[PDB]
Amino acid sequence: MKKYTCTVCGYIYNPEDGDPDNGVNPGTDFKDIPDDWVCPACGVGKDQFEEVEE
Ligand SMILES: [Fe+2]
């Protein structure tokens, strides 16, 4: 799974860690995160994130 970054603030979503305090368990691919989740650092929608190509 690839990491995704919030293109508004720079936060990085790492699938190995998830975002558990907001219901995203470690091991969740970004596309499977429920679509109403927002960036935990600035609050913008998932549509402002982009795949980080390794
Ligand atoms: Fe953000």
Curated annotation (Swiss-Prot):
Family to which this protein belongs: Belongs to the rubredoxin family.
UniProt GO molecular function: electron transfer activity; iron ion binding
N-formylmethionine found at: 1
Comment on bound cofactor: Binds 1 Fe(3+) ion per subunit.
Protein name according to UniProt: Rubredoxin
Cofactor annotation: Fe(3+)
Signal peptide: none
Pfam family, one: Rubredoxin
Superkingdom as given in the UniProt entry: Bacteria
Family annotation (PANTHER family): RUBREDOXIN, RUBREDOXIN-1-RELATED
UniProt lineage: Bacteria, Bacillati, Bacillota, Clostridia, Eubacteriales
Domain annotation Rubredoxin-like: ranges: 1-54
Gene3D superfamilies tied to this protein: 2.20.28.10
